[PDB]
Amino acid sequence: ATLLQLHFAFNGPFGDAMAEQLKPLAESINQEPGFLWKVWTESEKNHEAGGIYLFTDEKSALAYLEKHTARLKNLGVEEVVAKVFDVNEPLSQINQ
Amino acid sequence: ATLLQLHFAFNGPFGDAMAEQLKPLAESINQEPGFLWKVWTESEKNHEAGGIYLFTDEKSALAYLEKHTARLKNLGVEEVVAKVFDVNEPLSQINQA
């Protein structure tokens, strides 16, 4: 299983205002191939936002990453800091 | 809830070898204050490793981050790339399913 972790500068709405504006966005992710779960990341004080995605395979993740970067440009996000890793299942199992 | 997102350079064991080797370390983490869960991340190809932790709050997260960054020096991890974020609970649930 691959874990996609990315964040970017963001001035946009935070907290509940963000949950409202980006609700359609969130729902569209559940329709992405190989998508397992995402934890939405945000930081008002540092003007950043992002997310931790978990895909079944690296190919599903890279595909999403490429697409979502293009998409993020419409929110005016010019640079996307991302990292794609493999998940060590045995250890992750121990930690919940 | 706070989310600690971190990773660093790494040559150490990977795959099952890492699972075997670091197993002690994993269960000692379930004992950390404010700790909820962790996803161990690794990339042998790029020689990197790290983890995604979810604590009950900033204080818990930062205290662990200070503790961990120090002991990581023993495995020869000079510097660590970290980020502390707040989680948007509503949206996360739409995608936690």
UniProtKB/Swiss-Prot annotation, chain B:
UniProt key word Oxidoreductase: yes
GO cellular component assignments: cytosol
Pfam families: ydhR
Keyword Oxidoreductase annotated: yes
EC number: 1.-.-.-
Molecular function in Gene Ontology: oxidoreductase activity; protein homodimerization activity
InterPro entries to which the protein is assigned, alphabetical: Dimeric_a/b-barrel (IPR011008), YdhR (IPR014910)
UniProt entry keywords in alphabetical sequence: Oxidoreductase
Lineage top rank: taxon: Bacteria
Function summary: May function as monooxygenase and play a role in the metabolism of aromatic compounds.
Complex and partners: Homodimer.
PANTHER family linked: MONOOXYGENASE YDHR-RELATED, PTHR39169
Protein name, entry field: Putative monooxygenase YdhR
Gene: ydhR
